[PDB]
Every structure is written in C-alpha cells, then in structure tokens.
C-alpha cells in the first residue's frame, strides 16, 4: 500500500527497452522480464515472478506482432502469446491488485471507415486479421480480470530498440533500387518514445482507467507509402505507391485504421506529429 513496485514484461522488445530507459531517466525503479526470464505463456512461471516481485503496476509490453505470419505459419504462436499470455498477465494482475497497462492495436477495427474519419475508443471492434482478433481477446481478458487497467491501442510502432518498419525499409534500400509500399492503407506511425511517455503519463497522473487510443498525430491523411517516402528520402531508392491488390498478402489489413486521439489529448499529454517523432527518433539513434 505504501510502496509502488513496477514490473515491465516484454522488457527487451522495442517498447519495453524504450520504457526501461525512460524510467531510468526519471530515477524510477522497476523489475524487467522478457522471454529469457518469464515466459508469459506459462501461468506457473508468471505466478512465481509475481509472488517474488509483488508488483503494484505492470507495463505489459509482450506481444506477437507479425501480422502476415499470424494468418498461417505463426498462427499458433500468435494465439499463445496474444490470447494466453494476455490472460495470464491479466489474471496475475487481478490476483495481486496491480494496475495493468496493456498495449493493444488499431487492428482491432475492421478498417471500413471513409478516409478522413477516425476510430474512437467506444467504436465496436470487428477485427478481420488473426492478429487483431487475438489482440481483441486480450483486451477482453484485461477487462474481465484487471479491475485497474489502461488499454492503450497503438499503431505502426517504431523506435531505435528493436525491429520495425523503419529498419526494414532501410535494410531493403541498401540492396534494392525500387520498393513497393501500399498507398491505400491509412493510419499513423507511433514512435515508442511517445508511447512510453504516454503510458507513464496515464499512471503518473492517475487518469481514469479504461481505453485510450495513442499514435503520433498528423494534420493530413497518412498511408504506409507516405511514411516510407519520408523514411527513405535520403536514400537512392524509389518508393513506388501500390494498392493492396497489387500483391497477394496473407492478412486482410484494415484500409483505414486511423484513430481519433482526442481522449489522449484530453489527458493533457501532448502528442507530436509523426513527422516530428521520426525526426527525434533519428537524433536519439545517434547515441
């Protein structure tokens, strides 16, 4: 009751690493676990860590995020991590009375919203990808078992501390002169630093429990193509805009998953545009 005790799961991924370093800057202590310390798919290992740590606040950064793979070769792994693992951590948090910050996805929505319109927290999820379906089940487990929760739906996540679309683009551009990127899937990038700061803003300021949408912002419509054009603008590659029909993709990704950020902005947190965040990401990567 008098001591805050933070646990970070998925601590060595792009978001978990970002979050560790942010807490380190703020002089905040924590216990950090990932797959080599606490397999979230094994309820007994999860219980043993919570019994030792006795957390009051858990930032759950563990997820499976390979969308195409989740439809086929990774379908079993996607389900274990996003369904079972989410349930296990939600139940552990409820047992121990811990607040759970659960990171979810814009891919819970069906994506059938005109360009220009945006998804709000109270819209009904109806995911059409296996990844999104599993993440929605995770949300439902959190709501059932963790009385004190923040579910933060984020999008298109990138940062300096793990794999993502930015590094994929840069690697491909080293050896290939032409890349084809969809220009009919609308959404917004999210820098891990902005997301980690928002996670901490909710908890530091004890905002109302519930659901919050968080991506970086944009004044104008944004597609994957727009993001890739910007990332690669200093490279000798041509980024070619294509439609989603151009090549046979395994997952039917949402055509418009742009989130309304008004609730997040109502917290007082200030959200950079994705252009600003990308620039900051490049500067932070110099260290």
Residue numbers in the entry: -3 to 283
What did the authors write?
We show that gacA is an essential gene of GAS that encodes a metal‐independent dTDP‐4‐dehydrorhamnose reductase representative of a new class of monomeric RmlD enzymes. Bioinformatics analysis suggests that gacA encodes a dTDP‐4‐dehydrorhamnose reductase, an enzyme that catalyzes the final step in the production of dTDP‐L‐rhamnose. In general, RmlD enzymes are members of the large short‐chain dehydro‐genases/reductases (SDR) superfamily, which act on a wide family of substrates and commonly form homo‐dimeric or multimeric complexes (Kavanagh et al., 2008). GAS expresses a characteristic SCWP known as Lancefield Group A Antigen or Group A Carbohydrate (GAC).
To unravel why GacA functions as a monomer, we employed X‐ray crystallography. Crystals diffracted routinely below 1.2 Å and were subjected to synchrotron data collection. Consistent with our SEC and activity studies, GacA crystallized as a monomer. GacA contains the typical α‐helical/β‐sheet arrangement known as Rossmann fold present in SDR domains. In agreement with the well‐characterized SeRmlD (Blankenfeldt et al., 2002), the GacA β‐sheet is formed of six β‐strands, in the order 213457. This β‐sheet is flanked by three and four α‐helices on either side, respectively. The second 310‐helix η2 observed in SeRmlD (Blankenfeldt et al., 2002) is missing in GacA due to a shorter loop connecting α‐helix α7 and β‐strand β7. In comparison with SeRmlD, α8 from GacA lacks two α‐helical turns, due to a deletion of eight amino acids in GacA. No symmetry‐related GacA molecule forms protein–protein interactions via α1 and α10 as observed in SeRmlD (Blankenfeldt et al., 2002).
